[PDB]
């Protein structure tokens, strides 16, 4: 089941994959 | 904002662009 | 062999793992 | 700056803190 | 929690790991 | 067929062979 | 360094991520 | 054909579509 | 949803990442 | 012991040290 | 390119996948 | 012993059993 501490580690993979060479800011703390 | 939004059931390709630099 | 396009996807995992709840900015474009 | 620095042979735990928010 | 969109990405890893050099067809759309 | 079958609690090694080429 | 036996496990992740709900055939044996 | 083509330095988004079903 | 058979595969990544060069024993069978 | 303890909601950094060699 | 610090994180996945419910000792320090 | 042996080009299924508990 894990939690965001491990789920976000994979959301970023698709994030910069969609951005390509661009970058992004990841903040797991709403 | 983004984690709880995409870690629930994956977001759409465009929704991820909103967090692009 | 892949490239940064796939290597960075895993550097971020340890990044926010060290930051814990904090966040970080990942820009694969020096 | 960070990718070419850690994607070569992994960075140290403190080096990653420099990129923390 | 994510969904099949991310779960299948890891089911394939063990799939071709069991097939070895063989290949397989992955269709996430029953 | 295969995703909903193995993404629930992992399938057996032989069950994965059915989807091998 | 690993080899295709581990590199392909991650090429598929982006493959069906681009296909979305569609599927694809992965054969690591040219 | 696809592995040696994308496992070298990643393929483009359209190149991956050629292997889509 | 998967199960420990796939969840533990990622718990080990952070395990030896915290141990650094040290090692650890992983037994998914309480 | 360790899986059911960290696979539920991640363990703390020190808790992982208990399983270090 | 990364190094063992990241390569071993994935060797363990196949390790306990082959062991199934059994366990194993991973020591990245020959 | 095991890392430098399998992290070079993957080990065989039986070779991994030697490190099983």
Curated annotation (Swiss-Prot), chains B, D, F, H, J, L:
<feature type="disulfide bond">
    <location>
        <begin position="6"/>
        <end position="11"/>
    </location>
</feature>
<protein>
    <recommendedName>
        <fullName>Insulin A chain</fullName>
    </recommendedName>
</protein>
């Amino acid at each position: 089941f894990v939690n965001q501490h491990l789920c976000g580690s994979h959301l970023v993979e698709a994030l910069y994959l969609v951005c390509g060479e661009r970058g992004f800011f990841y903040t797991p703390k709403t | 904002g983004i984690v709880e939004q995409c870690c629930t059931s994956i977001c759409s390709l465009y929704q991820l662009e909103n967090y692009c630099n």
